[PDB]
Amino acid sequence: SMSNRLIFDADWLVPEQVQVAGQAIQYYAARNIQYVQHPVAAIQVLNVFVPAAYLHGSSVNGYQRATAPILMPNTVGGYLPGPADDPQRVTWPTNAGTIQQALKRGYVVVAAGIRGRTTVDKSGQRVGQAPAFIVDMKAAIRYVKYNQGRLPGDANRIITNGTSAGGATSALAGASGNSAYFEPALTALGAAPATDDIFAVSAYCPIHNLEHADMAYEWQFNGINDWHRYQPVAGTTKNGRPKFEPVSGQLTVEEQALSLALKAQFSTYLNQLKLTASDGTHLTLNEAGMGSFRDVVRQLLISSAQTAFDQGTDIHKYAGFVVTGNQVTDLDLSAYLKSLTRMKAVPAFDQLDLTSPENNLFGDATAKAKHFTALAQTRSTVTAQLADAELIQAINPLSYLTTTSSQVAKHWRIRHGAADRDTSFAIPIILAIMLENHGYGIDFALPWDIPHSGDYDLGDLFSWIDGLCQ
């Protein structure tokens, strides 16, 4: 209610500890903070964790109470609700380990609870579909920045982090700072009267650019007709990890047809982006999906393999790589992709029967699911509606990156595993290049043999953060 003044009190912080790397790490915690005046869902709370030194006037890793970076991780996966995280949390989903390490590194951590596609209110109406996820992320950022100087850490040094859907969430927060589009939603929530532009973005395999992901996916996996992924089983746990029974299928001629068309459409979309290499040349693809852009994808995978090769890794686990002496000199991209295997069917994202997580994301209180591409809407196998064009645009990080804006985060670090088949490599690569082209700092790589995951290189993530903030 309006009784919630959204004023943080350091007095709320109580002492706790956790074991990390053979050491006891002491911190303080304030949990279950209602970060808007008018929440519609119980998940809309945030947890604050603070290195103990900052409540004793002291330093960690060159940081103080006033100057510490504020890492704002989220637990969003599959565009599902993301509960407020906790270094003590053991139930799925959680990046508790990351919080532990971050506190050890001297970062303030603000772990916000985020609505997702399955979230219902008191009446049982859906209130977590798009753009609830980013609205909540922004509202939590606004709470932190409103409470600058009351809350430990530098609110001008907010660094978001997330994996997959959560990576898109993090990238979107960095891209869309102070966007007028989200103002009516934030106002109706009673979010804090402050800005939501952030300092830096960490994103692991950001599942974004959803309206172009089907085209990118088929550009990559066309010619490969068997798909291999995972699906629900159960068994009672102690901490709710939803378990994955395998299922594989075989592309129908209808599917193959869509695939070939989708692949072709990707050339057109890609070319109109006017992406440039650092030499300044237009990155392109021809009608068959070959060209300088494909060569860039190939070079990043080659770079990935070389790093692994130099560490004694057997890169021939996958097919396609040419090694000449001590150098990965070339790559048969098609052979590699076939050895990697296709994961999703066709379309990969905007399914014709509205059964994808992204279909459900684009639903509303009235519609459980919607299409978000013209092709899937035209070829729908169920009665369906197209999601609003402005909404699709609003939750795509790329929409904001057509210029150097002061509202866009200046510092970006993006990773997508070289064994991650959940979206085309082209998707994070486009994001990476567009950032570079427009003058933003961008640290990008496709880490060797890394599956759909995140937070696996914390030592390098934290080194990157420290390079920015100290």
Shortest Å distance, C-beta 363 to ligand E35: 14
Distance in angstroms (rounded) separating the CA atoms of residues 341 and 364: 34
- Residue 86 is labelled as binding a ligand: no
Residue among 384, 364, 365 at smallest CA distance from 374: 384
Contact at 8 Å (CB) between 44 and 34?
A: yes
CB burial of residue 235 (10 Å; 0-12, 13-18, 19+): exposed
The residue (of 263 and 421) whose beta carbon lies closer to ligand E35 is 421
Cα distance between residue 422 and residue 163, in whole Å = 12
Q: Of 73 and 357, which has the nearer Cβ to ligand E35?
A: 357
The residue (of 79 and 448) whose beta carbon lies closer to ligand E35 is 79
Residue 163 beta carbon to ligand E35: minimum distance, rounded to whole angstroms: 7
Q: C-beta of 92: minimal distance to ligand E35 in Å?
A: 11
Asked whether residue 38 is marked as a ligand-binding residue, the answer is no
Instruction: Supply the minimum distance, in Å, between the C-beta of residue 170 and ligand E35.
Output: 12
Considering the complex, what minimum distance in angstroms separates the CB of residue 401 from ligand E35? 20
Report CA 134 to chain centroid distance, whole Å. Answer: 11
Distance CA 170, CA 98 (A): 15
Q: Identify which of residues 130 and 141 has a Cβ nearer to ligand E35 in the complex.
A: 130
CB atoms within 10 A of CB 88: 16
Could you tell me how many residues make up the chain? Answer: 470
User: CB 451 → ligand E35: shortest distance, Å?
Assistant: 11
Whole-number minimum distance, CB 219 to ligand E35, in Å? 17
Q: Which is nearer to ligand E35, 39 or 166 (CB)?
A: 166
Residue nearest ligand E35 (C-beta atom):
164
Q: Residue holding tokens 């709470």?
A: 143
Nearer to ligand E35, 103 or 251 (CB): 251
* Of the candidates 312, 320, 279, the residue with the CA atom closest to the CA atom of residue 296: 279
Residues lying near ligand E35 in the complex (CB under 6 A) are found at 77-79, 164-165, 207, 357-358, 422
Closer residue to ligand E35 in complex, CB, 33/361:
361
Is 358 known as a binding-site position? yes
On whether 452 is known to bind a ligand per the annotation, the reply is yes
Give whichever of 52 and 391 is closer to ligand E35, judged by the CB atom.
Answer: 391
Rounded to a whole number of angstroms, the minimum distance from the CB of residue 462 to ligand E35 is 23
Strands 411-415 and 441-445: parallel
Cα–Cα distance for residue pair 384/381, rounded to 1 Å:
9
Cα 397 from Cα 200, distance rounded (Å): 14
Nearest to 161 by CA among 119, 213, 107, 117: 107
**66 vs 247, beta carbon nearer ligand E35:** 247
- The minimum distance between CB 77 and ligand E35, in angstroms, equals 4
CB of 95 or CB of 437, closer to ligand E35: 95
Closest approach of ligand E35 to the CB of residue 224, in Å: 17
Sequence ranges of the binding site for 3,4-dihydroxybenzoate: 78, 165, 344, 358, 422, 452
Sequence ranges of the binding site: 78, 165, 344, 358, 422, 452
